[PDB]
């Protein structure tokens, strides 16, 4: 069997919400790029959809994007706006083209998400410190071999001064360290906290630090033996971040106290009136503040899933703030919060995702109109077949009637509950409603036009079904899901006693239970062949059942966390599983096999439905968006030929008018390789070597004993080797002549016997120096 | 408290320059391994020229440390001296642990000035190790004459 879908990066998805802004980038000035779950290009003074860089098809590559999901950490622009660069939630940094949406390089070397990413004033160096407790310098070539500063234990915050030298660092470790650019050494570490350096800003020569201590500590630049100028105290709660003015005559500060305040005579106090304001600061603690590039306004990165526009009270700027404007999103973040429930229609052109206070209308990716009466998140949604009306259920015990034409509610469905509506679905023509209610009863509802005395547009409640007092040990009476037989013979419904009970179209007779569940269920469904039913429960166990009991077909235990929704295909061939662990699982119904696993949801998926079209997949999640689918002695001889080969080259320097072994001199190589070989059977390596090894050998001995190097070899090693090479071969069995080696050995051994006799006399005074005090401590 | 940490930044910084205040600063603090490193680079090179008391002379003066041993107190004497007990154990390093010992008897009197803690375990402990290192260098010396003495 062939299931739909693909493993490609895009299938006409509308998964990008353009929300959750933390940072922002100033690009062309008139345009301001917004860091969100994409890169969304904004205008700085209109707030309209200029362009959105997201997943799709760039020209020249496949499975390539404009930006990714899994929220972007920092966005910034090139100093000549000629480069695009995003650090993501992974350890890899992506550089995109500014004009096109191709990619240049992928930067790896971070094992954690990037917490600091920016350019310099030169632009040729990139800098990125991450949550893996180091800061990494980068180049347009890809040069990781420049620097690696690791002296921290947490994430890192502060950086550059544009002198191309003499960097500083502020980190979230409780430390603020000082460094030199050429050869890094912690000359001084300043510590004026006990918690976390939240935000960092230098004014002109004053570096201030914000922390959990709720204080602003000021600091000097050319600093040594830390300079202190004073402490500003008690913003009210810990400050989050701040910003200097682009004209550098003020300084704006931000906190999670929802108050922004600027210093002015800037100064060590706040000395300008603030009752000129008319468009009060913010509804939610904001993350980053930027002065606008038009030099009149303000851009505020709120934690209310959007960034905004304001101003700062001053005479050059607007002395009050204006109302905040937002961009043209697709009206997916223009409406407020997370989607709990979705529903599809019969014409396959009404995609509706409800929320805390909104119900939206989509065809595939184009939005028509919103409808708002929700006093809560909607636990279930259900269209009318034909696309005329839609019935909704909120967190109140309240069902809502909406028309498709406009935002006007036709009928508020009568409040007859004491607990909220979890589930609801209708029959084939749409004239029977079965709902979820913890009033310990099952409620049928009438449905027709209102031209009579029984309202079917308000669903007058004539019939009553209640027999729920069955005794268990878990809890007696609560239902979770309800499900209608599409052939209309029976009703299936979930219960909290780990059972499902089946009763037919009319009054109670007991077809079948299912029981044996370790945990209660969330989803049960009936196919169209109508012999089997699926069940899914919070024990990470999905079971298929026919009619049996106590004979388990197969306990499909394949997840890690509890499920959300498991449903059949709308033509009885496929069934799929979405869970809390943000992964879609395709499963063939005829077998127990799996065909396709979809992991492209970095956000937790809450609800999911697939239409009767058989060509797309609709998903609800926590970013509230839809993802539509379809030798040893040779080391000695080579070493000695190298070292003598260099010494003879340096011998005829100018009175007579190889990069590496390793050192400034090769002879430091020569002794250390003697320490490289092991303490056992190196004598075999010596006795291999002929007289030429001896002639080239003794010169390094006279070299190191004129150089007075005891720092890389030792007199026990030198005597331990030379006493062997004298006993193997030889002085008057290799030559017989009164030559320079013969008188060379005389000064060599005089150096050795003197230098070793010194240590001999030092020890020989040390011991009897120690005895005589024990002679007196009687 | 915090001045201990910035004081450790002083100890990390001081190693680039002179070794005397680095020696006293790491001596009164932790850790003695870096203290072993600065004594290694100071007393490490073989040199037997003009007047010292422990051999601390170079192109830049380190005999000031000779006075800094003179200014040292008794608890630092026992704290350094137990590190001499630890460093007399293995071969090839004990020579470094010799050098300060020949110093300290030159810079304090025989009483180990008046108020003296318990170190009879120490002054008992150092004698067999140095007695053991006596004979080895004696054999290297008396065998070193044999390569000259034949021809």
Curated annotation (Swiss-Prot), chain A:
One GO BP: maturation of SSU-rRNA
- Provide the GO MF annotations for this entry: snoRNA binding; U3 snoRNA binding
The UniProt family comment states: Belongs to the WD repeat WDR3/UTP12 family.
Tell me the keywords, alphabetical order. Nucleus, Repeat, Ribonucleoprotein, Ribosome biogenesis, rRNA processing, WD repeat
Determine if Repeat is one of this entry's keywords.
yes
Encoded by which gene?
Answer: DIP2
- Pinpoint the residue ranges of every WD repeat in the record: 67-97, 109-139, 151-180, 192-220, 334-363, 373-403, 416-446, 516-546, 558-588, 600-630
Q: What does this protein do?
A: Involved in nucleolar processing of pre-18S ribosomal RNA.
Which SUPFAM superfamilies does UniProt cross-reference here? Answer: Nucleoporin domain, WD40 repeat-like
Give a yes or no for keyword NADP in this entry. Answer: no
Protein name, entry field:
U3 small nucleolar RNA-associated protein 12
Q: Which Pfam families match?
A: Beta-prop_WDR3_1st, Beta-prop_WDR3_2nd, Utp12
Subunit structure comment from the entry: Interacts with snoRNA U3. Interacts with MPP10. Component of the ribosomal small subunit (SSU) processome composed of at least 40 protein subunits and snoRNA U3.
Q: Where in the cell is it found?
A: Nucleus, Nucleolus
In the UniProt entry for this protein, what further remark is given in the free-text comments?
Present with 9620 molecules/cell in log phase SD medium.
List the GO cellular component terms.
90S preribosome; nucleolus; nucleoplasm; Pwp2p-containing subcomplex of 90S preribosome; small-subunit processome
UniProtKB/Swiss-Prot annotation, chain B:
The residue intervals holding the WD repeats read 5-46
Q: Which residues cross the membrane?
A: none
Q: Where in the cell is it found?
A: Nucleus, Nucleolus
Function, as annotated: Involved in nucleolar processing of pre-18S ribosomal RNA.
UniProt miscellaneous comment: Present with 8070 molecules/cell in log phase SD medium.
Assembly and partners?
A: Interacts with snoRNA U3. Interacts with MPP10. Component of the ribosomal small subunit (SSU) processome composed of at least 40 protein subunits and snoRNA U3.
What protein is this chain from?
U3 small nucleolar RNA-associated protein 13
Q: What organism, scientifically named, is this protein from? A: Saccharomyces cerevisiae (strain ATCC 204508 / S288c) (Baker's yeast)
Source lineage: Eukaryota, Fungi, Dikarya, Ascomycota, Saccharomycotina
**What gene, per UniProt, encodes this protein?**
UTP13
Residues shown, of full length: 660 to 810 of 817
């Amino acid at each position: 069997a062939a299931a739909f879908g693909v493993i490609a990066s895009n299938a006409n998805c509308v998964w990008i919400p353009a929300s959750s802004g933390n940072s922002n980038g100033s690009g062309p000035g008139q345009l301001i790029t917004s860091a969100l779950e994409d890169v969304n290009i904004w205008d700085i003074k209109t707030g309209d959809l200029v362009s959105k860089l997201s997943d799709g098809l760039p020209p020249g590559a496949s499975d390539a994007r404009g930006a990714k999901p899994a929220e972007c950490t920092y966005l910034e622009a090139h100093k000549d706006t000629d480069l695009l660069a995003v650090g993501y939630a992974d350890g890899v940094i992506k550089v995109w083209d500014l004009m096109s949406k191709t990619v240049l390089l992928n930067f790896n070397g971070h094992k954690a998400a990037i917490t600091l990413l920016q350019f310099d004033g030169t632009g040729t160096r990139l800098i990125s410190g991450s949550k893996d407790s180091n800061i990494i310098v980068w180049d347009l070539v890809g040069e990781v071999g420049l620097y690696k500063l690791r002296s921290h234990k947490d994430s890192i915050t502060g950086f550059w001064c544009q002198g191309e030298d003499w960097l500083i660092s502020t980190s979230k470790d409780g430390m603020i360290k000082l460094w030199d650019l050429k050869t890094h050494q912690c000359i001084e570490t300043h510590i004026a906290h006990t918690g976390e350096c939240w935000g960092l800003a230098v004014k002109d020569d004053l570096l201030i630090t914000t922390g959990t201590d709720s204080q602003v500590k000021i600091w000097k630049l050319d600093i040594e033996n830390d300079k202190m100028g004073g402490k500003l105290t008690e913003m009210g709660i810990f400050e989050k971040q701040s910003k200097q003015r682009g004209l550098k005559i003020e300084f704006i500060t931000n906190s999670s106290d929802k108050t922004s305040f600027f210093y002015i005579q800037y100064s060590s106090f706040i000395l300008h009136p603030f009752q000129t304001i008319r468009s009060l600061y913010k509804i939610k603690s904001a993350s980053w503040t930027t002065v606008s590039s038009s030099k009149l306004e303000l851009v505020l990165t709120t934690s209310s899933n959007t960034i905004e526009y304001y101003s700062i009270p001053y005479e050059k700027r607007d002395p009050t703030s204006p109302a905040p404007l937002k961009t043209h999103t697709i009206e997916l973040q223009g409406q407020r919060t997370d989607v709990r429930s979705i529903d599809i229609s019969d014409d396959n052109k009404l995609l509706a995702t409800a929320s805390n206070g909104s119900l939206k209308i989509w065809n595939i990716k184009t939005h028509k109109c919103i409808r708002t009466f929700e006093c809560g998140y909607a636990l279930t949604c259900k269209f009318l077949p034909g696309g005329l009306l839609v019935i909704l259920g909120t967190r109140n015990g309240e069902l809502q009637l909406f028309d498709l034409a406009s935002s006007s509610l036709l009928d508020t469905i009568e409040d007859a509950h004491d607990a909220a509506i979890w589930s609801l679905d209708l029959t084939s023509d749409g004239k029977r409603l079965v709902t979820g209610s913890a009033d310990k009863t099952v409620k049928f509802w009438d449905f027709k036009v209102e031209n009579s005395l029984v309202p079917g547009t308000k669903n007058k409640f004539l019939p009553v079904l209640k027999l729920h007092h069955d005794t268990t040990l878990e809890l007696t009476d609560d239902i979770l899901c309800v499900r209608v037989s599409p052939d209309d013979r029976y009703l299936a419904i979930s219960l909290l006693d780990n059972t499902v009970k089946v009763f037919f179209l009319d009054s109670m007779k007991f077809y079948l239970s299912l029981y044996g569940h370790k945990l209660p269920v969330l989803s049960i469904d009936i196919s169209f062949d109508s012999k089997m039913i699926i069940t899914s429960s919070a024990d990470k166990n999905i079971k298929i059942w026919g009619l049996d009991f106590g004979d388990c077909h197969k306990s499909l235990f394949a997840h890690q966390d509890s499920i959300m929704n498991v449903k059949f295909l709308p033509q009885s061939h496929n069934f799929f599983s979405c869970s809390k662990d943000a992964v879609v699982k395709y499963w063939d119904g005829e077998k127990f096999e799996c065909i396709q696993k979809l992991y492209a949801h970095q956000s937790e998926v809450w609800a999911l439905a697939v239409a009767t079209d058989g060509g797309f997949v609709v998903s609800s999640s926590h970013d509230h968006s839809i993802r539509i689918w379809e030798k040893a002695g040779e080391r000695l001889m080579e070493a000695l030929d190298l070292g003598i080969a260099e010494i003879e080259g340096l011998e005829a320097y100018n009175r007579d008018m190889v990069l590496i072994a390793v050192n400034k001199t090769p002879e430091q190589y020569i002794m250390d390789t003697l320490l490289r070989i092991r303490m056992s059977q190196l004598e075999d390596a010596l006795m291999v070597m002929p007289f030429s090894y001896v002639l080239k050998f003794l010169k390094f001995i006279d070299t190191v004993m004129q150089n007075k190097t005891l720092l890389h070899s030792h007199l026990p090693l030198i005597c331990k080797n030379l006493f062997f090479i004298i006993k193997f071969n030889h002085k008057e069995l290799v030559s017989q002549k009164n030559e320079e080696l013969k008188l060379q050995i005389n000064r060599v051994k005089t150096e050795l016997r003197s230098a070793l006799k010194s240590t001999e006399d030092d020890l020989g005074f040390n011991v009897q120096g120690l005895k005589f005090v024990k002679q007196q401590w009687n | 408290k915090l001045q201990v940490e910035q004081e450790q930044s002083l100890q990390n910084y001081m190693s680039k320059g002179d070794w005397t205040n680095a020696f006293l600063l790491a001596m009164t603090l932790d850790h003695p391994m870096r203290l072993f490193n600065v004594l290694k680079r100071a007393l490490g090179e073989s040199r037997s020229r003009q007047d010292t008391e422990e051999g601390k002379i170079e192109v830049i003066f380190n005999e000031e440390l000779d006075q800094a041993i003179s200014i040292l107190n008794d608890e630092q004497l026992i704290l350094l001296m137990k590190r001499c007990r630890d460093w007399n154990t293995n071969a090839k390093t004990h020579t470094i642990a010799q050098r300060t010992i020949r110093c300290i008897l030159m810079h304090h009197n025989i009483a180990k000035l008046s108020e003296i803690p318990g170190m009879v375990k120490i002054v008992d402990a150092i004698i067999p190790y140095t007695q053991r290192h006596f004979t080895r260098v004696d054999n290297l010396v008396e065998q070193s004459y044999i390569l000259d003495y034949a021809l």
